[PDB]
Design a protein around this nucleic acid. Sequence first.
RNA 1: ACUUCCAAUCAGUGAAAUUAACCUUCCCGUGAAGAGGCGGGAAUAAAAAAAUAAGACGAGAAGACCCUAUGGAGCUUUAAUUA
RNA 2: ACAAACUCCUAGCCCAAUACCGGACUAAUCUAUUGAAACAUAGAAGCAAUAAUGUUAAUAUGAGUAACAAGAAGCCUUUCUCCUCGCACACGCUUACAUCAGUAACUAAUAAUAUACUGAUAAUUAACAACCAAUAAACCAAAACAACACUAAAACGUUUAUUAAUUACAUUGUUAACCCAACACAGGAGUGCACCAAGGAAAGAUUAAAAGAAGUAAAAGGAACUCGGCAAACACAAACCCCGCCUG
RNA 3: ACCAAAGCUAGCUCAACAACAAAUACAAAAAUACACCAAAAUAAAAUAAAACAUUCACCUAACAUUAAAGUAUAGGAGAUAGAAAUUUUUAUCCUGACGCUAUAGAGAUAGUACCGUAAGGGAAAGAUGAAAGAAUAAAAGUAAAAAAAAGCAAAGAUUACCCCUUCUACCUUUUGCAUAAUGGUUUAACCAGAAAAAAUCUAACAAAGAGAACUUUAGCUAGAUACCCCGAAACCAGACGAGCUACCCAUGAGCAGUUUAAAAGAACCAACUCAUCUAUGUGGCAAAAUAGUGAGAAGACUUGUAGGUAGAGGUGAAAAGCCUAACGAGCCUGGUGAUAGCUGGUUGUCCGAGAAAGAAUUUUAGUUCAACCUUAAAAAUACCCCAAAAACCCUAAAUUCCA
Lengths: 140, 166, 110
Amino acid sequence: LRSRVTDRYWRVQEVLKHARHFRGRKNRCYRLAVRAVTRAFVKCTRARRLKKRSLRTLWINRITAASQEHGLKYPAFIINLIKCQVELNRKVLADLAIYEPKTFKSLAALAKRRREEGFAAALGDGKEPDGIFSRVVQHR
Amino acid sequence: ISRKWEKKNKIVYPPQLPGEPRRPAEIYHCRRQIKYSKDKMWYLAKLIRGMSIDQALAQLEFSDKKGAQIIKEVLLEAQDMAVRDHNVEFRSNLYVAESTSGRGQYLKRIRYHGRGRFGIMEKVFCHYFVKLVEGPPPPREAPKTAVAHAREYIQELRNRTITHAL
Amino acid sequence: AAPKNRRSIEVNRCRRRNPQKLIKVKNNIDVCPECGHLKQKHILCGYCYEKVRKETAEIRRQMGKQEGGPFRAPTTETVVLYSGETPSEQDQGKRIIERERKRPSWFTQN
RNA sequence: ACUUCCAAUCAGUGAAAUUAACCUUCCCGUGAAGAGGCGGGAAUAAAAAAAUAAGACGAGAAGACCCUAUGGAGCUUUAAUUA
RNA sequence: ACAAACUCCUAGCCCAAUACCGGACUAAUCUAUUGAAACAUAGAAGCAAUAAUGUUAAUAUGAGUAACAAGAAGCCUUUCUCCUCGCACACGCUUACAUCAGUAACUAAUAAUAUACUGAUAAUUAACAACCAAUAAACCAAAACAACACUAAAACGUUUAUUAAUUACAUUGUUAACCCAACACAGGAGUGCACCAAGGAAAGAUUAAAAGAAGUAAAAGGAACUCGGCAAACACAAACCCCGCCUG
RNA sequence: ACCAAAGCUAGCUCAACAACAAAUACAAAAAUACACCAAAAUAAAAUAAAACAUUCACCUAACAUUAAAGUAUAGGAGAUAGAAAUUUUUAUCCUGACGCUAUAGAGAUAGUACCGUAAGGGAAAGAUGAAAGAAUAAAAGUAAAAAAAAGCAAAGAUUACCCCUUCUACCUUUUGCAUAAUGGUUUAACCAGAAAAAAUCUAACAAAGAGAACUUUAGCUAGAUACCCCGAAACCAGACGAGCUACCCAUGAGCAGUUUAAAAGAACCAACUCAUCUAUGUGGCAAAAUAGUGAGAAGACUUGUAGGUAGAGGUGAAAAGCCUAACGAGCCUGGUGAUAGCUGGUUGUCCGAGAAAGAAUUUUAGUUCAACCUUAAAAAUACCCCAAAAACCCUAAAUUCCA
Ligand SMILES: [Mg+2]
Ligand SMILES: [Mg+2]
Ligand SMILES: [Mg+2]
Ligand SMILES: [Mg+2]
Ligand SMILES: [Mg+2]
Ligand SMILES: [Mg+2]
Ligand SMILES: [Mg+2]
Ligand SMILES: [Mg+2]
Ligand SMILES: [Mg+2]
Ligand SMILES: [Mg+2]
Ligand SMILES: [Mg+2]
Ligand SMILES: [Mg+2]
Ligand SMILES: [Mg+2]
Ligand SMILES: [Mg+2]
Ligand SMILES: [Mg+2]
Ligand SMILES: [Mg+2]
Ligand SMILES: [Mg+2]
Ligand SMILES: [Mg+2]
Ligand SMILES: [Mg+2]
Ligand SMILES: [Mg+2]
Ligand SMILES: [Mg+2]
Ligand SMILES: [Mg+2]
Ligand SMILES: [Mg+2]
Ligand SMILES: [Mg+2]
Ligand SMILES: [Mg+2]
Ligand SMILES: [Mg+2]
Ligand SMILES: [Mg+2]
Ligand SMILES: [Mg+2]
Ligand SMILES: [Mg+2]
Ligand SMILES: [Mg+2]
Ligand SMILES: [Mg+2]
Ligand SMILES: [Mg+2]
Ligand SMILES: [Mg+2]
Ligand SMILES: [Mg+2]
Ligand SMILES: [Mg+2]
Ligand SMILES: [Mg+2]
Ligand SMILES: [Mg+2]
Ligand SMILES: [Mg+2]
Ligand SMILES: [Mg+2]
Ligand SMILES: [Mg+2]
Ligand SMILES: [Mg+2]
Ligand SMILES: [Mg+2]
Ligand SMILES: [Mg+2]
Ligand SMILES: [Mg+2]
Ligand SMILES: [Mg+2]
Ligand SMILES: [Mg+2]
Ligand SMILES: [Mg+2]
Ligand SMILES: [Mg+2]
Ligand SMILES: [Mg+2]
Ligand SMILES: [Mg+2]
Ligand SMILES: [Mg+2]
Ligand SMILES: [Mg+2]
Ligand SMILES: [Mg+2]
Ligand SMILES: [Mg+2]
Ligand SMILES: [Mg+2]
Ligand SMILES: [Mg+2]
Ligand SMILES: [Mg+2]
Ligand SMILES: [Mg+2]
Ligand SMILES: [Mg+2]
Ligand SMILES: [Mg+2]
Ligand SMILES: [Mg+2]
Ligand SMILES: [Mg+2]
Ligand SMILES: [Mg+2]
Ligand SMILES: [Mg+2]
Ligand SMILES: [Mg+2]
Ligand SMILES: [Mg+2]
Ligand SMILES: [Mg+2]
Ligand SMILES: [Mg+2]
Ligand SMILES: [Mg+2]
Ligand SMILES: [Mg+2]
Ligand SMILES: [Mg+2]
Ligand SMILES: [Mg+2]
Ligand SMILES: [Mg+2]
Ligand SMILES: [Mg+2]
Ligand SMILES: [Mg+2]
Ligand SMILES: [Mg+2]
Ligand SMILES: [Zn+2]
């Protein structure tokens, strides 16, 4: 009972589906296609991992620029926003930086205020005064 | 073998509704198994494209290549069928729409070398295809002006988005 | 030296479709006022030169008949005649070739 | 110096080894220890035709050298078994 | 501050891997029953190629690159311009030869046209050449322009006798441009007469780069070159060694 | 749009059953004249024994089938080889196919073309229809439709092709490969894991089980689970080869001139023969040539036709030369799927768990044992581990052993 593979056409089609937009001979010849397609998928999955650090880099830059406009550097801005107990994404923060410049300058004013409060608190060398923005709320 | 091109003359259209644009005559013609090579034939085919049939005949006539006499006869045949078998008023009204070479079937032979070595020598044949259309030759495209470029560039600067930003 | 790699069709299209390897369009083509065929500006008309050539061939045949052998050639000037023509005194004393065709319009009497 | 065959341009006919894919730069480092592909820098419209051979550890022959198979063979005798 | 596969967070089908070893499914065939258009349970196997300097077929690249050919003019076979392996037979090839016709494409390494492609028709005629008796007996005495010799001691038959069907005309070879080298090969090929009386064309068209091949000439110098006076010369001669004695 | 692509038939596998007439062995295809006929001597080796000498099934014969039995025996008592006594078997009829469809199946449309002097090798291909007494556009390669700074050619993406940013082709092979290690132009079709002793798993019946012979202290019987592909140089038997070349045996044929008393292995120099030296040529004009230049040129000279010697051999003015474009031993067909501890290859997806060298070895390119490990099972303690304890002169980090 001799058997041959009749459906070889669709087997090839399934790997050429992905190969159509490649340059040169990879979009035709089944060898070249197979290899370039495996390459393509591997870089696909690595890109999934990268694109999270890329987007986060982008965000940090935009936050840095927005912060620079108001004369405050990136680390200062972020730390002080945190020490005020305001937890905001860098995604949400960069979006505020572009599409709501007013609110964002409000934030930068807040952070700057909180920081000067910090310098004054630590240089003052006494334990008593709580700057109005230095109090810490425990939730109920 | 595949014969298709020849059959493109066998299409019969539905009659004309009143006052529409008159669809200009298309004539197809080919010549199969010319003793010329495909690559040389290509240059002749490339030369006459878009020309009016009279200019094409003029060029071909004085050209040196042995393909010239061939493509010439083919254009004359095409013209004769254009006026006779189809109906075309004013036989100089034709221009060349599409001109092209395909490879025909090839002959195989031995080519002796030396020290008893042989190469495999392929006798070359090719087909010549031409499509003629009745009407004055389409206008040749003018090189982009500075007023064009500046328009592209502005249209691009103005197509930007703030990315990943919403 | 043996080529290190097969070239892609891209590279080949670049090389052999170059504007230099394309056949140039000859701009000096005109029509000949007589037969209205095509000719190049600096070259004689092909179709005209044909009928000239044929007639020269035939007149050379008849003047080959008027000569007896290979080495025997006339010392007189020659003048060719056509049906209905009789020699002028300027042209007499010369060898005469007589022809059936009435004198062709492009060939003058002089 | 000059002639002739090649030669280069036009017209016919038309092979060969070779070739993972190539969208096929230079420098200095690095690295399976000598990089067009890595790192840090440089330089850089796009294609032809003509040349020169520095590189592609260039192309040709599963190195004739060397060593290793409980691989072969030819030659010589006090190798060992012997018609 | 920025920085991971680490750790949180929101959801899950819930945690890497070469040799070897376990599991779950399934592509394509065929056979049992179903199924009706692609079928689902079983049973079976020539049961699944991106890799063997894999095998066959076909296509590219190198590449329209390397390389190939036809002396001039005319009235179309007539003159010219040049170079010289020519005609027979033997062997061997087998119709490639002859006439008329056709060549789009096949053969020619291109064309023109055709001794070499295709079709039809014909053809070399025997006195030359092949085939073509035996047995007895005499005969020591070279060919060599052959007188006579030489050493190396020389191929070849006449005549006498005994019988030999006896009787027109047997049968067979008769073309060629040819054969052996894969080729319509710068090569290999015996003999008799020839040096032309016979055979043939070294250039498809240009342009006049380099580098290559072949040839010619060169001021003064004449081996200073280089392993070597190799190659080349308006030279062509002398001498000395080593090794073999010598021709082979 | 070209080039191409598709059919189902020709026939095959495997198995049952059981046109004369003439002409020919003259140099086959030639009617015809004196002879002769006719003949026979063990199979060898490749290979197993991890070498190799004794030994190595099958290869000739028939004897079959179920057993006795892989038992008695025979063996460098190694590798392996291997009976018989004695037992079993019902008739024919009843043919087909979980066999191939044109790279398959015969080598086959054929032993033909073609390749070889010769023995011998040995192909490729066919596809419309009732009727031709009717005329799908899907592989690679190309065309429609040259190409614009940048870089394994993609990916993340973007309004946007690029431009940005991130990435050392793939196999094989190794301690380690982007390697400048091997392999591949590309497409299509072909192209490589076979065994049932022991075991596990699922069932039958059970002190028994098997449709005969056997095995049985839970066993027996049945099913299912298993172990590749391509490569030498070689060696042995029998054929075919001396139209090349080596040497002979027949029978023929050449050698002009010039010099010399001379045909004297004397001079000079042609035809003819060789092959010195240089340059071209190197897939050539040529699987050894062409141009110049050279040696010999009445002799151990060249050359024609026809015989002869054949591989454990022939022939050799020995070069280990030559014996038909590869001779330290010809070519062909068998043995022959020779044998390769050595390269090179080995085809679907997805999950579990996962290895680094202690011994011996003609062994160190390999095997076979231990240790680690994987898959099943049965159990009880396992690592960690405080005192206490382990040598005598000096002797650190630390081990061993245990609640
Ligand atoms: Mg089948
Ligand atoms: Mg994550
Ligand atoms: Mg080709
Ligand atoms: Mg050319
Ligand atoms: Mg580039
Ligand atoms: Mg280093
Ligand atoms: Mg470097
Ligand atoms: Mg060139
Ligand atoms: Mg170079
Ligand atoms: Mg490289
Ligand atoms: Mg080198
Ligand atoms: Mg090697
Ligand atoms: Mg050895
Ligand atoms: Mg050995
Ligand atoms: Mg982070
Ligand atoms: Mg795992
Ligand atoms: Mg298979
Ligand atoms: Mg395949
Ligand atoms: Mg190779
Ligand atoms: Mg392959
Ligand atoms: Mg090509
Ligand atoms: Mg080139
Ligand atoms: Mg050339
Ligand atoms: Mg010529
Ligand atoms: Mg003869
Ligand atoms: Mg031709
Ligand atoms: Mg004869
Ligand atoms: Mg004869
Ligand atoms: Mg004759
Ligand atoms: Mg040859
Ligand atoms: Mg020429
Ligand atoms: Mg020059
Ligand atoms: Mg010179
Ligand atoms: Mg000179
Ligand atoms: Mg001088
Ligand atoms: Mg000197
Ligand atoms: Mg010097
Ligand atoms: Mg010296
Ligand atoms: Mg010299
Ligand atoms: Mg000395
Ligand atoms: Mg000597
Ligand atoms: Mg001599
Ligand atoms: Mg052995
Ligand atoms: Mg073995
Ligand atoms: Mg051995
Ligand atoms: Mg045996
Ligand atoms: Mg077949
Ligand atoms: Mg033959
Ligand atoms: Mg295609
Ligand atoms: Mg880029
Ligand atoms: Mg690396
Ligand atoms: Mg490999
Ligand atoms: Mg290594
Ligand atoms: Mg390296
Ligand atoms: Mg290498
Ligand atoms: Mg290697
Ligand atoms: Mg390679
Ligand atoms: Mg068992
Ligand atoms: Mg049990
Ligand atoms: Mg032996
Ligand atoms: Mg052996
Ligand atoms: Mg003989
Ligand atoms: Mg002989
Ligand atoms: Mg003489
Ligand atoms: Mg002499
Ligand atoms: Mg010379
Ligand atoms: Mg001499
Ligand atoms: Mg001498
Ligand atoms: Mg001798
Ligand atoms: Mg010796
Ligand atoms: Mg020796
Ligand atoms: Mg040989
Ligand atoms: Mg094997
Ligand atoms: Mg031992
Ligand atoms: Mg080993
Ligand atoms: Mg314990
Ligand atoms: Zn005119």
